[PDB]
């Protein structure tokens, strides 16, 4: 596979997102790391899909809403940042105030 | 020109009279005073103040009042106060708390806090800064426990063990000269301060003392090695000669004596009573009465902290598992019921709040959680505020008194108890620069950066392959202070005076900073900061009810805690 | 009682910066063709040569703006700014090498400024 | 007997006139010459040539012209050529490039390239071998960055930092004697070559110079510490005395001067201009004009490399995040728009292709990617071939000229700029054996094996529990060169002459190889291999349009790159 | 996400449980580490759901039965222990003789 | 669970395969590490199922076809190797030219 250090680390974000998604699906309000994991994995998968940085800055604000998360979680998350390989190489996406 | 307070706090962190919520608790701390000169705040970045000829002095060499490191705009939470200041570090030590920058052009600059060519900058605006936690009940069982401790703001581990040997799995003991030597050498690779306890057992002095001379920093008396009157006595006679502390886990079984017999053996000498509530060990059911005595330095371990709805079920079973007890053997059930008591655990919450139990600790990996000493301290304070109200001593509607009482339990008090408070345990000039930065939203839960001897050792930081350090995954990671030979200069091995005088560090090739244990035998309860109360604690032998000043101490267990499911992935 | 973890509850009132120090308003023009942004704590007389102002009025002073902020001049932009007095020892070293000592030595500072083409020495 | 070329290349790697595609780019390199004697190729294995009495000599001791290591059948890609040779290493250094084996029986054996009892063998047939990359813009922020760098073929990190302190997070600076000492000690545990930059700020010489004497290898002037005429001047006066290089990140704000003022302060002295395009920092909007000057050694950092459809959106926001800028504050928006410019980023692609920007670098973890210097170099070359055609200098239909121009940017040129090219930066006899093997399909993307000082330090290798090393998971892993005390002998700490003369390595107990920085002040643009062009670069202050020789330099951003989604799991 | 050491480790238990569950679903009798993983993840997810320690001590004995696992596996597992964050903080759950 | 070093590592292959499978299911042509992960996990799960080495050498050539992967990926993968515990202990499987 030739995994580099970042590829190994970033597998763990996907895993944490899968965990959080299962928790959401059984009806739980999500906590801080769960919310961050879901949005982060969404960005990374979006890059893989070939979306632009600008599309993901927009979409990342609609992945989770306040009713999906515990009290205070929206205000704990000022932004979520992720780097991923786009069709045009690694780029940084920052989603500002992802959950209103 | 004036700035409103909201905007001021956003830019520089809070100032006098402003309050900050601790994580998701109901506890608020208030800035008591501020060392700054408004308008001359230090800060670092593009077009900011700490630039050459401006807030950075361009003239002075490092020796000439210049700092190695300035933490700008810190909100300090410490037994000494809750206040706003810059913190200056040099040669690995805190050398100034005050106002940093350049006397060329700024008013109010503390004279030895010059930002110069030699100065690194950490921005502490909007952070709470505390001393590194001092955990005095550590079993050295699994090296992976060190990062667990660092991640929750612990910087000193005092205890014993050789790894997952049964003696060590039960007791904070590194026994005998050879095991001590081996563990001092192992310590060279642990990125945290360390002090090692020998076995406080024997009926002759020499077998006990040779451990001190070998490099132990103290002793541990534990019932699993025979917490007899003789072992108690000999250990304290050694400790008095050697100027080290003795920790005790007493005879739960009351086999050779009841509490009064253990106190008679102690004979007024200073001792650190571990897990004084007793679920963690000690004379059943009344060990916690130790915490009323003037010669006793009393700590709790953490799984009883605070009293919750799952506590009893969890502990009763934890005890059965660990002792291989059987549910159908009445002696085993009776033993467990005599040891795990809601009456004493509920009173333990209150005794903390009253300043009668002076210290927290973990019992890491034996009956306690390496990364939850700080966590559970604050959860306890929060529960007590909810159930008992703001303390009478509070002013305004701040929780400053309670915050100073509780921060003392895991910083300065354990340091004083172990004879190491000259080096560590508080944010004071002249002490080692072990500092923990916290985002208020994560306060007490997950440390932002842990500074050891003036260099960051551990940090919550992100993708090492990214353009900047904040992208995911943000996780706790060892930093440059832990790498290469820098691990030697950023950490302290605490040792007895006799081992130091006898040249043990050179004999063993120890490269770490060597700390001297001292002034352990001339202290008492009165020396426990904000937690100095002596009183007669009565524990009813039949009902286990606890009374102080004729009043039953009871409170309810809570179903929910802050600093819990909002934060943790598991 | 919604909880925002770690939130502030600031006190009432406002913070006055640089309290008790003399304030001076002066007009400043960026005569250059590129933007110039000036930080709160630069000795004002030592800013970019192409800023035109009464250089004498920048001696011993800096911008009266919150610590760590800056004033921006687009090309050709002229505006007023408010200065405050430097504090401490009122000495400046380095930067543009116009002072290198006490800010009281106005004649020497201005001589150097003039010779090096810092605009606005009167 | 004759072998067809396809079969020959399959067995021994390519020979003269054969071409090889670089990863999934459109770039082809052609073998220019071959040192072998056809039929006497060296190889290792069952029934193969390097066996005793055959291609391995059985007579000579190690001292007698025998190698410690032979890389067989390497396709070398280097500023010195693109050619086929065996590479012989001894005492950690490259001692022979030519033809290895046994003079007993083989023709054409380079006299000091005897395969003997003492010789290890690496099979390089079918691999491309380059020098280890020299990254001269490293922020030491997170130790996990080292493996990221190794995995993409970097072997030397020059820069500064103390970990995730704000000074270090912004600037490649280890400030003052104490922080420098601490980081030299930390470096003992980093498995990569290192040189440390001090703070190039001050108005007196002594505070700056004492950093050089403490063990810094150079200085960094950064606007966040005040990139003033005074700090520029004093740093260069120090550098000229000390024979070390100065890197500059200039005054973006034009606060104390415009570009011409910075050039006046430099006063014709040699300087390394970091991220010369300026998105990474510098005089807005015209900093890139520095790259026209003969005394300037100009590098790019990597996030602008090459110009792509997501570049601007990504950078504008990256800058807003890092500077805590607000979208509704016009000064902040104006600052960002003045700094992140498609006009200068597009021209930067072309200036690379023209040999006007001489060097690549990362800006690791401050505004750049630790593991993408090599990657983006080749992506840039590929884009330029697509958009500008083969360069005029090319012969046949190979891209050899462009390949030598671009490999120079991350190997030899940074080494020359920093005064370390006597030790590292190219595959030449007499230099340290820092060598990177690449499978052509992974060229520039993921290194196969990274050799440090003649021992493999990092490799893409599989299951450690398997019968053989190739089963999954194949991942980058630290190898024996990084373990124990071998980390000392396989890596170099580069230091100033004065610190070496003053005995700093002994004072600090440094065990790594010590490299001397020298010959930094007597060089210029003309000394940048294949990238030596001086010209007047005009940058229009209104439109930001870049002209060279009266022609606007513009190109389009691309939607797709090679060396991207075919390879990476994220 | 601010993952601490335990959060990182415990992701791997969830993963091993997901693996084991897929093996069970395609009809395999589960082995020792598979069985332990499934029951351990069940406990941790139960804590996340807000169940009590006592509930999980009971439920953990009904997650897998002997027909779900290979010969000898029930007798190899004397107990399964897990710590997780309950609504009232970290607690230890021990499931005794989980598979009869 | 008593995880040894290989068991821990190999969990990550399963995870990478799960990731790749989700990418394939949403219609993406798979890249080099994704393809390797899918085939590798297939081999390991096959061993767990009790298939023979010879069966897996055959089946591994039919897991992904060239239309499932990006241009050049079939030619990048000369073989895929995995070791797993068969009913008769650890064995090595090499799938030669898995994608034509
Ligand atoms: Ni105990
Ligand atoms: Ni204990
Ligand atoms: Ni820069
Ligand atoms: Ni930089
Ligand atoms: O204990
Ligand atoms: O930079």
Q: Which of D272, D283, D315, D323 is catalytic?
A: D323
Provide, as residue numbers in chain E, all residues whose Cβ is less than 8 Å from the Cβ of F18: 18
Provide, as residue numbers in chain B, all residues whose Cβ is less than 8 Å from the Cβ of D186: 455, 480-481, 483-486
Let me know if D323 is a catalytic residue. yes
Chains D and E touch (3+ CB pairs under 8 A): no
Give yes or no: residues B170 and B216 share one domain. yes
Dist CA C86 CA B102 (whole Å):
11
- CB atoms closer than 10 angstroms to residue D250: 31
Taking alpha carbons only, the member of A84, A82, A66 closest to residue A74 is A66
Say if strands D551-552 and F89-96 run parallel, antiparallel, or are unpaired.
Answer: unpaired
CA angle in degrees (0–180, nearest 5) for B241-B246-B252 = 140
* Residue-number span of the structural domain to which B411 is assigned: 132-425+484-570
Ligand 5 pocket at CB < 6 A = B 249, 274-275, 280-281, 363, 366-367
Distance from CA of D316 to the nearest CA of A (A): 11
H-run or E-run covering A12: helix A5-25
Domain with residue D519: its CATH number is 3.20.20.140
Asked if residue B220 belongs to a known ligand binding site, the reply is yes
Contact assessment for residue B108 and residue B130, using Cβ atoms and an 8 Å cutoff: no
Domain boundaries, chain E: 2-100
Say if strands B69-78 and B81-90 run parallel, antiparallel, or are unpaired.
Answer: antiparallel
**D514 burial type by CB count under 10 A (0-12 exposed, 13-18 middle, 19+ buried):** middle
CA of B314 to the centre of ligand 6 (A): 53
F87 touches A: beta carbon within 8 Å: no
Give yes or no: residues B160 and B91 share one domain. no
Dist CA D255 CA C62 (whole Å):
13
Relative orientation angle of helices B373-388 and B342-353, to the nearest 10 degrees: 90
Phi, psi (5° rounding) for residue B234? -65, -40
Report which DSSP code applies to D225.
G
CA of B96 to the centre of ligand 1 (A): 39
Nearest Cβ partner of C36 from D203, D234, D253? D253
Provide, as residue numbers in chain B, all residues whose Cβ is less than 8 Å from the Cβ of D225: 50-52, 56
The answer to whether the Cβ–Cβ distance between A87 and D561 falls below 8 Å is yes
Give yes or no: residues D63 and D18 share one domain. yes
The answer to whether the Cβ–Cβ distance between D467 and F73 falls below 8 Å is no
SS3 F91: strand
The answer to whether the Cβ–Cβ distance between A87 and D560 falls below 8 Å is yes
Contact assessment for residue C78 and residue C28, using Cβ atoms and an 8 Å cutoff: yes
Contact assessment for residue E43 and residue E95, using Cβ atoms and an 8 Å cutoff: yes
Report which DSSP code applies to D292.
G
Provide, as residue numbers in chain B, all residues whose Cβ is less than 8 Å from the Cβ of A19: 569
C39 → chain D, closest CA residue: D255
> Buried b / exposed e across D148-174, counting CB within 10 Å, b at 16+?
bbbbbbbbbbbbbbbbbbbbbbbbbbb
SS3 B147: helix
Taking alpha carbons only, the member of E7, E22, B475, E14 closest to residue A19 is E14
Contact assessment for residue A16 and residue A30, using Cβ atoms and an 8 Å cutoff: no
Nearest Cβ partner of B567 from A13, A19, A32? A32
CA angle in degrees (0–180, nearest 5) for D367-D369-D374 = 130
CA of D200 to the centre of ligand 6 (A): 14
A67 touches C: beta carbon within 8 Å: no
Dist CA B127 CA B74 (whole Å):
6
Helices (H), chain F: 5-25, 32-49, 53-59, 73-76
**D67 burial type by CB count under 10 A (0-12 exposed, 13-18 middle, 19+ buried):** buried
Dist CA D509 CA D522 (whole Å):
32
As a residue count, chain B comes to 570
Give yes or no: residues D332 and D269 share one domain. yes
Given D436, D460, D483, the domain boundary residue is D483
> Buried b / exposed e across D34-46, counting CB within 10 Å, b at 16+?
bbbeeebbbbbee
Dist CA B221 CA C31 (whole Å):
80
Contact assessment for residue D512 and residue D500, using Cβ atoms and an 8 Å cutoff: no
CA of A83 to the centre of ligand 6 (A): 19
The answer to whether the Cβ–Cβ distance between F14 and E15 falls below 8 Å is yes
Give yes or no: residues D173 and D267 share one domain. yes
Helices (H), D131-217: 145-151, 166-170, 176-187, 205-214
H-run or E-run covering B3: strand B2-4
Provide, as residue numbers in chain F, all residues whose Cβ is less than 8 Å from the Cβ of E28: 48-49
Structural domain count of chain B: 2
**C45 burial type by CB count under 10 A (0-12 exposed, 13-18 middle, 19+ buried):** buried
Of D204, D221, D230, D341, which to mutate for an interface test with C (greatest number of C Cβ within 10 Å)? Answer: D230
- CB atoms closer than 10 angstroms to residue E68: 17
Asked if residue D352 belongs to a known ligand binding site, the reply is no
Dist CA B250 CA B259 (whole Å):
8
Dist CA B172 CA B524 (whole Å):
22
Asked if residue D422 belongs to a known ligand binding site, the reply is no
Say if strands C51-52 and C23-30 run parallel, antiparallel, or are unpaired.
Answer: antiparallel
Dist CA C36 CA C77 (whole Å):
10
The answer to whether the Cβ–Cβ distance between C3 and A71 falls below 8 Å is yes
Q: Which of B201, B293, B315, B323 is catalytic?
A: B323
Name the neighbours of F, counting chains with at least 3 Cβ pairs within 8 A.
Answer: A, D, E
How much of chain C is helix, strand and coil, in % rounded to 5?
A: 15, 30, 55
The answer to whether the Cβ–Cβ distance between A40 and B465 falls below 8 Å is no
Chains C and E touch (3+ CB pairs under 8 A): no
Asked if residue B422 belongs to a known ligand binding site, the reply is no
Taking alpha carbons only, the member of D208, E91, F36 closest to residue B368 is E91
CA of D311 to the centre of ligand 3 (A): 18
Contact assessment for residue C73 and residue D255, using Cβ atoms and an 8 Å cutoff: no
Mark the breaks in chain C: residue after which each occurs, C to N over 2.5 Å.
none
Q: Which residues contact C65 (CB under 8 A, 6 or more apart)?
A: B1, C17, C40, C71, C82
CA angle in degrees (0–180, nearest 5) for A51-A52-A54 = 130
Homologous superfamily of the E2-100 domain (CATH): Urease, gamma-like subunit (3.30.280.10)
As a residue count, chain C comes to 122
Name the experiment that determined this structure: X-ray
Given D483, D508, D529, the domain boundary residue is D483
Nearest bound ligand to the CA of residue D222: 3
F15 touches E: beta carbon within 8 Å: yes
E85 touches F: beta carbon within 8 Å: no
**F100 burial type by CB count under 10 A (0-12 exposed, 13-18 middle, 19+ buried):** exposed
Nearest bound ligand to the CA of residue D365: 4
Ligand 6 pocket at CB < 6 A = D 249, 274-275, 280-281, 363, 366-367
Distances in Å between the Cα of A7 and the Cα atoms of A83, A85, D141, D569, F21 are 11, 10, 20, 6, 17
Taking any CB pair shorter than 8 Å as contact, residues of chain B touching chain A are 24, 441, 462-468, 470-473, 565-569
Relative orientation angle of helices D400-410 and D373-388, to the nearest 10 degrees: 150
SS3 for B356-402, per residue?
A: CCCECCCCECCCCCCCCHHHHHHHHHHHHHHHHCCCCCCCCCCCHHH
Q: Per DSSP, what are the bridge partners of residue D70? A: D88, D121
CA of D229 to the centre of ligand 4 (A): 20
Both tokens assigned to D520: 């930094």
Contact assessment for residue B310 and residue E53, using Cβ atoms and an 8 Å cutoff: yes
- CB atoms closer than 10 angstroms to residue B72: 29
Taking alpha carbons only, the member of B134, A35, B370 closest to residue E6 is B370
Chains C and F touch (3+ CB pairs under 8 A): no
The answer to whether the Cβ–Cβ distance between D231 and B52 falls below 8 Å is yes
Give yes or no: residues D107 and D224 share one domain. no
Provide, as residue numbers in chain D, all residues whose Cβ is less than 8 Å from the Cβ of F12: 473
Dist CA B72 CA B99 (whole Å):
9
Give yes or no: residues B380 and B515 share one domain. yes
Name the neighbours of A, counting chains with at least 3 Cβ pairs within 8 A.
Answer: B, C, D, E, F
Both tokens assigned to F65: 């076809």
Residue A42 CA from chain centroid, whole number: 4
User: Helices then strands (H, E): number in chain B?
Assistant: 16, 24
Contact assessment for residue C17 and residue B3, using Cβ atoms and an 8 Å cutoff: yes
CATH of C1-122, one of 3.30.300.30, 2.10.150.10, 2.40.50.1070, 2.130.10.10: 2.10.150.10
Taking alpha carbons only, the member of B96, B116, B249 closest to residue D177 is B116
F95 touches D: beta carbon within 8 Å: no
Q: What is the DSSP string of B457-496?
A: EEEEE--TTSSSS-SSPPEEEE-GGGSTTHHHHS-EEEE-
C2 touches B: beta carbon within 8 Å: no
């Amino acid at each position: 596979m030739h995994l580099n250090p970042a590829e190994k680390e970033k597998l763990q974000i996907f895993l944490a997102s899968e965990l959080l998604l299962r928790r959401k699906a059984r009806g739980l309000k999500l906590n801080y790391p769960e919310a961050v994991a879901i949005i982060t994995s969404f960005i990374m998968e979006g890059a893989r899909d070939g979306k632009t940085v600008a599309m993901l800055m927009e979409e990342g604000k609609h992945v989770l809403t306040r009713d999906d998360v515990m009290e205070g979680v929206p205000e704990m998350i000022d932004d979520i940042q992720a780097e991923a390989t786009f069709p045009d190489g690694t780029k940084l996406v920052t989603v500002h105030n992802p959950i209103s | 020109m004036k700035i409103n307070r909201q905007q001021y706090a956003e830019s520089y962190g809070p100032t006098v009279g402003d309050e900050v919520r601790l994580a998701d608790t109901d506890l608020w701390i208030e800035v008591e005073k501020d060392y700054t000169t408004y308008g001359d705040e230090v800060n670092f970045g593009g077009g900011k103040v700490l630039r050459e000829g401006m807030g950075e002095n361009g003239t002075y060499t490092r020796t000439e009042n210049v700092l190695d490191l300035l933490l700008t705009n810190a909100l300090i939470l410490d037994y000494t106060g809750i206040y706003k200041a810059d913190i200056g570090v040099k040669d690995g030590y805190i050398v100034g708390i005050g106002k940093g920058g350049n006397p060329d052009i700024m008013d109010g600059v503390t004279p030895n806090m010059i930002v110069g060519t030699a100065t690194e900058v950490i921005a502490a605006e909007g952070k709470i800064v505390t001393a590194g936690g001092i955990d005095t009940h550590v079993h050295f069982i699994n090296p992976d426990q060190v990062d667990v401790a660092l991640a929750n703001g612990i910087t000193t581990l005092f205890g014993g063990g050789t790894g997952p040997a049964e003696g060590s799995k039960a007791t904070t003991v590194t026994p005998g000269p050879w095991n001590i030597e081996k563990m001092l050498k192992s310590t060279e690779g642990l990125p945290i301060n360390v002090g090692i306890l020998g076995k406080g057992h024997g009926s002759s002095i020499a077998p006990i003392m040779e451990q001190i001379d070998a490099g132990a920093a103290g002793l541990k008396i534990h019932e699993d090695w025979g917490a007899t009157p003789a072992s108690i006595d000999r250990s304290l006679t050694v400790a008095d000669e050697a100027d080290v502390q003795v920790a005790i886990h007493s005879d739960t079984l009351n086999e050779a004596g009841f509490l009064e017999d253990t106190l008679r053996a102690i004979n007024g000498r200073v001792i650190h009573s571990f897990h004084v509530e007793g679920a963690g060990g000690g004379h059943a059911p009344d060990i916690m009465a130790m915490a009323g005595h003037p010669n006793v330095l009393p700590s709790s371990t953490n799984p009883t902290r605070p009293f919750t709805v799952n506590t009893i079920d969890e502990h009763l079973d934890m005890l059965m598992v660990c002792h291989h007890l059987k549910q159908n053997i009445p002696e085993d059930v009776a033993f467990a019921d005599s040891r795990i008591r809601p009456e004493t655990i509920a009173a333990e919450d209150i005794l903390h709040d009253l300043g009668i139990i002076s210290m927290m600790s973990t019992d890491a990996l034996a009956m306690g959680r390496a990364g939850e000493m700080v966590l559970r301290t604050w959860q306890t304070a929060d529960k007590m505020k909810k159930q008992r109200g703001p303390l009478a001593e509070e002013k305004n509607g701040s929780d400053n008194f309670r915050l100073k009482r509780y921060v003392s339990k895991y910083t300065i008090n354990p340091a004083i108890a172990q004879g190491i408070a000259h080096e560590v345990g508080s944010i004071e000039e002249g002490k080692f620069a072990d500092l923990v930065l916290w985002e208020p939203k994560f306060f007490g839960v997950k440390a932002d950066r842990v500074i050891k001897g003036g260099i960051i050792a551990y940090a919550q930081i992100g993708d090492p392959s990214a353009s900047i350090p904040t992208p995911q995954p943000v996780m706790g990671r060892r930093m440059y202070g832990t790498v290469g030979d820098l691990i030697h200069d950023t950490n302290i091995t605490f040792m007895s005076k006799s081992s130091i005088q006898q040249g043990v560090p050179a004999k063993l090739g120890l490269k770490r900073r060597i700390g001297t244990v001292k002034n352990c035998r001339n202290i008492g309860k009165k020396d426990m900061k904000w937690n100095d109360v002596t009183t007669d604690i009565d524990i009813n032998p039949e009902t286990y009810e606890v009374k102080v000043d004729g009043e039953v101490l009871t409170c309810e267990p809570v179903k929910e805690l802050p600093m819990a499911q909002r934060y943790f992935l598991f | 009682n919604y909880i925002v973890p770690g939130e502030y509850r600031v006190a009432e009132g406002e913070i006055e910066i640089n309290a008790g120090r003399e304030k001076t308003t002066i007009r400043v023009s960026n005569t250059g063709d590129r933007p110039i942004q000036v930080g709160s704590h630069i000795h004002f007389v030592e800013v970019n040569k192409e800023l035109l102002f009464d250089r004498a009025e920048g001696i011993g002073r800096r911008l009266n703006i919150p610590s760590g902020t800056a004033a921006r001049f687009e090309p050709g932009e002229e505006m007023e700014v408010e200065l405050t007095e430097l504090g401490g020892n009122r000495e400046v070293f380095g930067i543009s090498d116009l002072t290198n000592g006490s800010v009281d030595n106005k004649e020497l500072i201005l001589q150097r400024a003039k010779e090096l083409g810092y605009k606005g020495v009167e």
